[PDB]
Design a protein around this nucleic acid. Sequence first.
DNA 1: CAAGACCAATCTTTACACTCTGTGAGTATTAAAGTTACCTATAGCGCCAAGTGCGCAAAGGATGAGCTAGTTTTT
Lengths: 133, 149, 149, 368
Amino acid sequence: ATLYPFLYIETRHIDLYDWNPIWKLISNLNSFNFDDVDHDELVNFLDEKISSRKGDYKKYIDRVVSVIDTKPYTYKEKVINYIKVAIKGDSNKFLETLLHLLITLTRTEFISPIVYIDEPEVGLHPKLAESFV
Amino acid sequence: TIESIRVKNLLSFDDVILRDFRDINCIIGRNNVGKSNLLKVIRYFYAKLENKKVIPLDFHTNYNAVGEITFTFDTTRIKKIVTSRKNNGRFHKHIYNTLFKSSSVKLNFEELIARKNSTNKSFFSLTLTICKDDSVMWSVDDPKVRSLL
Amino acid sequence: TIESIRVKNLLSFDDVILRDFRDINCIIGRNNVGKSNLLKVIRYFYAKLENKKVIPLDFHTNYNAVGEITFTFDTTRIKKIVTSRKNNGRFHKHIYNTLFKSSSVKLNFEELIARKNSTNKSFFSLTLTICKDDSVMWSVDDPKVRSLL
Amino acid sequence: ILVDKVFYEKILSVESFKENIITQSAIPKISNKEVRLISSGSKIFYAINNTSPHSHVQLRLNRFFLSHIPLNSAAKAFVRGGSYLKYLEPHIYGSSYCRLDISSFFNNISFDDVKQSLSPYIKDEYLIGTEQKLIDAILNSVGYESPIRKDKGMIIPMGFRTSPAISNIVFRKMDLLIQDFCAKKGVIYSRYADDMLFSNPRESKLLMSDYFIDEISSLLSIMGFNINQSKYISREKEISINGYVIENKGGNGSIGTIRLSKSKLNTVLKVTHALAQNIPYKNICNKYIKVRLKEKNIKYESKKDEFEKKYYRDQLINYLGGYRSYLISLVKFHSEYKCVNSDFIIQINGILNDIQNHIQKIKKNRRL
DNA sequence: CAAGACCAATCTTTACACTCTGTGAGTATTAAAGTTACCTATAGCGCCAAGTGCGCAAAGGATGAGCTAGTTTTT
């Protein structure tokens, strides 16, 4: 299952405000170990970057955590947060981005997914479908 | 049976007029936003006809102060039905009093006969105006006419 | 920092005034429609403060022509913060331009010295008026003041 | 659009004032030795020389600068796509008609109003050193110090190329105010140059009351404009404006009609009758039309009795073609909007056929 | 004769300062990053140098040719 993932995309009833398939595809197709990043070191770096007094962002984060106490982040959530903080921004366009990202990322890895797309031409001009292909 | 639809300074319209409608009118194009805007304009007009509280549409430019929607109805068959001497009913007389009463009492005895009873087509025009302060005005100040239409 | 809320001729209100708010306020009663109407009034006022297109509220009776929503904010702490010879910032000097001033420039040198007492409270009032034609009027014609509030 | 120093350096002033920029010299104003003083009745027209640095700058400003500033849709004069027919069209739905005029429209335009209107579209910077600004340099090419009107200072004169666009830009604010006022009353308003037309579709006497005139005067007093009390017309169910007749018998959901009076077409009918009665072309072109070939305009004698005849033939055929173009413009307007009487359509179709036949006969006679 | 009613956009947001890290009573008090950021374009005709011009409007041969110009509105 982890070597040959299966991805299903529905084009008619698609939620453009959800990017979960993109995040899953990015997380699965990575060649980095995100566990080597020290949380304390990154927090210290951010605190030194934004401070009118040494040790102010750390206090704010600690006060927030003391009342937002919930389950710890999983590995996938951590890598998603790192990707989001690294990138600069968050029907046909969504599918094109999915296909292009799948082709680009699956070039230096031995994971070969399988993708099923249902009715890619829903609500599209014929020239738009030709341009997509 | 609408004949003319005119939109001025609303959404993505500056001055757009649609006429010469047929039975199987078909709409194609690349700009889907225009089709959506036309549908929204029609739905807004028909919601304001039935006295429903809806959000007024936006303006194409802010250097004007009005937005007008004009509808023309071909009231020819109904006039022939009502004005006939054979039909004596409550609904026919009410329709005559609502639609064809005001426009017919201002004519002499020459234009009514042999000038509007042979082949003429009767039209009814209704205009809806949206102001800058989100105010809605009608060209005809009678809810009964709007309800009947 | 908000004291008075007044509603005249809207929904199920003839003339209702709420004041003397505490840290914790509990609302009880069997008339849930009144609570829902109060929530709707507050949400409508705060949506109009942020320049959002929303449906105007209905009138309690049609023998009037206006519907008023009045809000009063306590600005003592902000006045003390801004008008001190200690804070020289872009945001400090903008609140005095928008929220304050135009009320101290009209005062002489004897009212200002008497308005600096430690037992003085400063109030700001906003009024929203709804007309019969679904028009919206404000007592203060300045979007910057509304955005800051 | 935002004009900066480079835009005036390259686009607005490419070669006319390039000498005065490198030398660090102020841009001169238009002197009294470069403008004519044409007179027509009680009207004075200022004509600039066709070979002058300011004329090219004015043309470039008209084409590249004074063509992108937004206007108001109530203004249908001196704008692409506007016409007198579009100025009369919206009022077919009304039952009461009112007409107003502005006295001395171009002479009462304040120069500071023009400067304030054009300021947001021009960058605030010094074009030449620290003596002249870009806005002042641009504005010195549109004004003129009238010797006969020294009391009023310097104004934008009629007859220049950039005057209509400036007038529309200045009067956009007043058009917005008047349109906002008329919207609440349910009155359709249109403006052509300095003429205002108001139409009421409901059955009321608002347009015949002094309250409307007082309100319009109060609105126009902000910018210093006045109405002309000798050209005030207010009628019901029928109005005539320079031969254009707009009629609407009244009633809910009633659509009016637009036609032309018989006096409007009198000259062309007379010309057609004279041509059908075999009247000499000299008399036709001198009496009915106001075209005359003066002997001073003749340059070289060469041959005598061959250029006058062809000149008169060309003038007659040009007049007929222009009037045919006007009539078919009316026909196209009808096809677009369908607000023209059917009998008038039949009459103009017959007139067009007669005019075309006369043109063909003239061409055949000239060929023979 | 005077008169309330004096446009939209001008790029967009967002936000405490200090020594004290929690609190502030000016006679008249925004501003600096970020992200963009817009397009204007040509007239008689032909020729040779090919657009930055020159010549000519008799051909043609470098200054006799010859030489018109629509309607309506504002005004």
